[PDB]
């Protein structure tokens, strides 16, 4: 048999017809079609009144999206007696084998029925439902001249990995609450279920800490390239968490330590050996900053930050970073990371950290390794300790240029086009581990505007999203590429300023 890899498309990027991404476990089409009309209602029914109330909220979220493009005023009804022309969302009789996020979605001429085990699975299934309707449905304004049809069809679905995440770096360049909510919303449509906020680095500190107010008054006032920076108040952070929760997305906040800490060091002189504030940094250098690993003030600082952040962050996890601590000795790093893990645990939070944080003698089997290095030896400690691993290989570093000539992006992991972002498996990155899942990382050294974020995340994130959701055996670039071409109008309709990748 003959095989080949993909080259660029001759003559440039290519960028009744559902466009489901990520690819579901099964999808069949039959004769006939459902028509969504102005008289449609969404019916919801759970196993008890509390569950029905949760489904009702999901129902309203769906109604809002459908109403924006159809111009209809679809409303939601708590009833298990859907009428012809209805969408029906239920958790009664879910197939347990599909787990918390899985669902069946069956469309007949008279009814759309989504059957899940949990409300979460109804929400994920609703992302597929939107992709079954014609392109145009994802517009934010009313679309005329499109019949709102869904083919008779049968879908069953569940994720391969539990953790399918996106990290946004808001330290290198700041992004507004609205901008962050938008990226969370867009990602949710592709079944991304985790959002990691990189809230602090050398160039800025982005979260209000009431006990150390100069973290904002001094530490938030810049970014890479000398823009004004910005920050989130605790109320704003809680708002982001709530917005994510409506999409069944867990928010994991990161305070990077002991490295990548210049903004803290520029805010409080007492965090430095000479007692003087560091000058703020607006360059892109890394590795030079460190907290004082053998001073008690360091641990008081970390405890105050963790106390305040834990109080406003419902996720059981806090990310404490641990990358590029090149101004911290191996011995001091081991000690520091163990000490801060104990603090986090005392506030009821489990610790996530970048490699090599798993090597800390203070780690527990409840700590999580975010494996970014993905070398043969990375996560040896994590594996021995039974720690879950989140993988972020080069293929998930979405801030890499698509190509040599990309106008934005970095290139220290090489180039990552839409094909490279697809053609990998988490088991490539680390062997013999408990792989919790995947996280796409969008560092922002070179991204200033929302358009920059869109360009780099779309279509790259779609590739990563499918790697997290769809089983390896059902992933195939030639298949995905053609599906992505079909999906393009939907990206346009969402107002995503995507890159028309010439490999698609
Ligand atoms: C975990 C991680 O990726 N840390 C840094 C790696 N080096 C990159 C280029 O300097 C930085 O963007 C990341 O912050």
UniProtKB/TrEMBL annotation:
Its EC number is 3.2.1.52. This is Beta-hexosaminidase. It comes from Paenibacillus sp.
């Amino acid at each position: 048999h003959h095989h080949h890899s993909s080259g660029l498309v001759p003559r440039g990027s290519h960028m009744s017809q559902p466009s489901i991404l990520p690819k579901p476990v099964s999808y069949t089409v039959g004769s006939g079609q459902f028509v969504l009309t102005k008289n449609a209602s969404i019916f919801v029914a759970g196993n008890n009144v509390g569950e029905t109330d949760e489904l009702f909220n999901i129902g309203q979220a769906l109604a809002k999206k459908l109403n924006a493009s159809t111009g209809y005023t679809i409303s939601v009804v708590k009833s298990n007696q859907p009428t012809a022309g209805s969408i029906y969302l239920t958790t009664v009789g879910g197939n347990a084998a599909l787990g918390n996020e899985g669902y069946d979605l069956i469309t007949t001429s008279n009814q759309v029925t989504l059957t899940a085990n949990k409300p979460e699975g109804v929400f994920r299934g609703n992302q597929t439902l939107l992709q079954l309707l014609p392109a145009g449905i994802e517009k934010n304004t009313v679309v005329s001249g499109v019949q709102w049809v869904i083919p008779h069809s049968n879908i069953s679905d569940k994720p391969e990995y539990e953790y399918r995440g996106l990290m946004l770096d808001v330290a290198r360049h700041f992004f507004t609450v609205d901008e962050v909510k938008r990226q969370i919303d867009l990602a949710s449509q592709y079944k991304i279920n985790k959002f990691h906020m990189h809230l602090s680095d050398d160039q800025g500190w982005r979260i209000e800490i009431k006990s150390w107010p100069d973290l904002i008054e001094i530490g938030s006032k810049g970014q890479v390239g000398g823009g004004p920076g910005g920050y989130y108040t605790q109320e704003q952070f809680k708002d982001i968490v709530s917005y994510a929760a409506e999409r069944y997305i867990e928010v994991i906040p990161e305070i990077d330590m002991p490295g990548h800490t210049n903004a803290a060091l520029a805010s409080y002189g007492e965090l430095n050996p000479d007692g003087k504030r560091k000058a703020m940094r607006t360059d892109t250098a890394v590795g030079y900053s460190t907290l004082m690993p053998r001073a008690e003030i360091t641990y008081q600082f970390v405890e105050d930050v963790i106390s305040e952040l834990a109080a406003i962050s419902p996720s059981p996890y806090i990310h404490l970073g641990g990358d590029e601590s090149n101004a911290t000795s191996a011995a001091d790093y081991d000690y520091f990371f163990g000490r801060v893990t104990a603090i986090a645990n005392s506030y009821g939070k489990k610790v996530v950290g970048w490699d090599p944080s798993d090597t800390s003698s203070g780690a527990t089997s409840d700590s999580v390794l975010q494996n970014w290095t993905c070398s043969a030896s990375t996560g040896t400690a994590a594996k021995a300790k039974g720690m879950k691993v989140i993988v972020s290989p080069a293929n998930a570093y979405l801030d890499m240029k698509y190509y040599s000539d990309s106008p934005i992006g970095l290139q220290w992991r090489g180039f990552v086009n839409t094909n490279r972002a697809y053609n990998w498996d988490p088991t490539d990155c680390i062997k013999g581990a408990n792989i919790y899942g995947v996280e796409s990382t969008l560092w922002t050294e070179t991204f200033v505007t929302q358009d920059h974020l869109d360009y780099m995340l779309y279509p790259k994130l779609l590739s990563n999203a499918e790697v997290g959701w769809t089983a390896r055996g059902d992933r195939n670039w030639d298949d995905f590429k053609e599906r992505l071409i079909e999906h393009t109008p939907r990206l346009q309709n969402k107002g995503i300023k995507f890159f028309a990748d010439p490999i698609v």
